Point group: D2
């Protein structure tokens, strides 16, 4: 019954603080990590994903993020390693690395940019797994990648015993339900924070999110209350969170989330160029959001 | 009447020449209210093959539907058309028949500006004096209506709500919050449970013609907090919905009703009749879910 | 004998009054302007440009009849009868055939997600009932409907599907179609890309802006085919200034405003299209003086 | 200080089984583009070179090998665009120190960057390298569209000297052409070379020119000579080639055409799959029919 359900829970998609030269701030990274567990009371980190600006880093920076995040948390804390890269050699090297550190599972975004064939995408996942022997979590983000995965295609992927589930962000709830019903034996972690409540009643096993770095407590309440049948209160907390998410998005989500962390005393530094620093023309509105929701 | 609740998007049976089978139409209407226990009918919508009809057929449908059902049945008339004159004329005829509100698809095909789209709704309201329900269906029309555009529409005291089909639950949420006193009726049968926990006041659907009981149970159980059960029922409804789409929805839905002894006739060309090659699979569905 | 349908057509504009009723005398002036002033080979009638999809059946007939009575017997006349209502499409196709239009045309059925087999048989039904030649009208940007080459060949296999009014913005698809169907009429419908369309082997063009810019359009088409490509292109530069400007202002109302400045009773657009905005007038007059419209 | 008009090969790269660069093979591909295909230049480490699959050393190696493989009459453009701005700067410097005539960069993708962010990514690379820059716009792969307004702001930088244009819109191309008469426009859709030519492009960069450049130049010359019907006939032929190679997996197949000439074409880098032998006969017919 609990087969493949080990990595259930709520996960922060770890944010990364940089210095003026795109270099990782290690003490700040350590702080954001500890904030996700200790303050936001979350189950795990999903490390070197979209939110950690992973795709702007060189190979050594990524390793560095994999190392500091595991150092900064206790053994009870679930850890997923996003090692997806267009460079399959890099992703294997990062895969072996993350595995040897004790990350409980790997994840990889679907290959993008090039119009890869399904067969090509499938064997990208098969090759990472072959070389690393770790469990693998599909990361489907069609809004950034342009890549869509039919139900027939998940069936082919989920047919590998080491492809354990999916970080699901397509916004389609007909698809999510088909998937949920077709593959009950597989983990589905949802990736759209602003739709947590809908994903919960669609039977997701949990969620991964950028905004759970600042709003992990409301997010837990949303997930737990919906699973309890307290729909109305879950939805009201989803209103609050959607105020939050909509505001962060209109200011540049990763810098803004990082400014919210700064305000708690964290050294959240800067985003990596070409991402721009938080624009001060947004500061007041950001402070109102913070006061109002006590972030 | 307050317009809350569950509506069949009324299907229409046609003969070989694409003419309305009045007697089968009466039967389809009575099936929705009496057998499927629905609150009302949404008449001349997408599911009634409305956009294939001429003006007289439209009137004929409005008349036969209204005459077929109890006085206390909620009735919404989709009068939306690319021909504004036609829509005004149809809005008047249905209002005079006693339809409780009007509904109109966002003008489509031509790339109308928002202002143009706005005053089409306002011209319709002005000529008819009936309440109006926006029919938003971007998958069919290519027209999206942003939150600010909903604000301006909803500022009109006679635009009392939306039949919402955009597959976007972040926007559904924002609209639900920004407009707590407007009517929201969801249009995606396959996502009724997600729409319900999102605070819609009801739902309009083509598959409620055959599966309105299950639909009611999703809406009620989800709101009473029996969410696991609501969701299981959605799993079941989505087998039904998936099969039917794969077979051509309107004719397949009509084949299901024909099975109950209803004279569900034919789809209007250029839709093709139900393909016999699907019948076994359809029979298995009907048998499995007692349709 | 049948006319060679090759050539340059106005997508005919229609003037209305305050109530969305056809202004017949203006419509006549518009049809005469296209042929006598703009010097075009023919009329494509009740197309997108005639605000056709806004009309009732009686109105579409009216427009078919006025357009035909307005031009000489030499003038090529194509009737757009595409409609979601197949019965109406057939009644219109027969009415235009009886008027003596040289070909029918029909937009691909839209709104509903029709099947390709369904789109095909809508066309075959129209032909069966009218016995006229049929021109497919591909406007994927308004319909959201696309036709692949295999779908075009299944369509073009009908001997009475004589061609396509092609408005997809894909010059790879167009080349393939040009290649695969040398025996079929391809008329391009993207006025702003007439030069590229000519050099790709189109048999002519249908277009709304030819109502005011037909002289330049003909020179683009002639010069491009004579290999005077640099001058051809310069006239497309100038033509696209005009297209872009009227686009920005609401194309059908603005084109009818230009017709108005020639003394034509171009009336109003049919609502929900709004009338030409006075705030654009100055710019339009400058455009009119600079390109002598 | 060359003007950069003309026909470029987007240079393909041959790999071994472990995704490593086959150098000897690379040299043959550069020389085939220049010597056999009679082209003005190479666009190096672009989409066609499986660039975005490579690590940083690999991109250097390609830049270095391609450059050593050709003479000084040969115009060279270094595509250094990268989600990693540090890396993009690093490569830009390296290419510029090797003598590349200009740099090029794909618009930052994956993340939904704002325009200001896209603009300053280009400005920083210029700042750091001081070479000329060529915008690589490829909306079909990136989902990034550049408006005429955004081109004007970009082209306002004296070092942004042009654009490799692969958008499929000829109204926009014509607009661009008219508004920026002083800038370089190199079209990137091989299947639309003729239409781009008569639309006033200064030349073209393409993957199929590795095997069909001779035929390409004739499209480009004939259409300018106004030998339009002939140019277009050669576009027909070319598009039979393009369509056939696309249906088989463009980069591997193109490299298999090169093998028939005795080039050590190697393999593509995974997750790209090697040319599938089920296509062999059809490819051989194509090579035979179009004399490749």
């Amino acid at each position: 019954h609990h087969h493949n359900k080990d990595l259930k829970g709520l996960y922060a998609a770890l944010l990364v603080p940089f210095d003026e030269n795109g270099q990782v701030n290690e003490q700040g990274l350590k702080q954001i990590a500890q904030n996700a567990i200790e303050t936001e009371e979350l189950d795990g980190l999903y490390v070197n994903g979209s939110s950690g600006e992973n795709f702007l880093l060189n190979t050594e920076q990524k390793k560095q993020v994999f190392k500091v995040a595991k150092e900064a948390v206790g053994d009870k804390v679930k850890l997923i390693a996003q090692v997806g890269s267009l460079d399959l050699n890099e992703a294997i090297e990062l895969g072996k690395y993350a595995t040897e550190l004790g990350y409980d599972a790997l994840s990889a975004v679907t290959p993008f940019y090039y119009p890869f064939t399904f067969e090509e995408i499938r064997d990208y996942y098969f090759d990472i797994i072959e070389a690393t022997q770790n469990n693998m979590i599909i990361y489907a983000i069609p809004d950034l990648t342009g890549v869509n995965i039919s139900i027939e295609q998940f069936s082919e992927l989920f047919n590998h015993e080491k492809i354990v589930g999916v970080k699901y962000t397509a916004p389609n709830f007909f698809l999510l339900e088909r998937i949920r019903k077709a593959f009950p034996d597989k983990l589905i972690l949802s990736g759209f924070d602003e739709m947590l409540v809908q994903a919960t009643i669609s039977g997701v096993d949990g969620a991964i999110g950028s905004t759970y770095n600042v709003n992990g407590r409301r997010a837990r309440k949303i997930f737990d209350l919906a699973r309890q049948g307290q729909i109305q209160e879950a939805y009201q907390l989803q209103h609050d969170s959607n105020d939050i998410i909509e505001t962060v998005l209109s200011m540049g989500i990763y810098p803004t989330l990082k400014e919210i962390l700064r305000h708690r005393g964290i050294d959240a530094g800067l985003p990596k160029r070409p991402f721009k620093p938080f624009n001060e023309a947004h500061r007041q509105t950001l402070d109102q959001l913070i006061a109002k929701y006590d972030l």
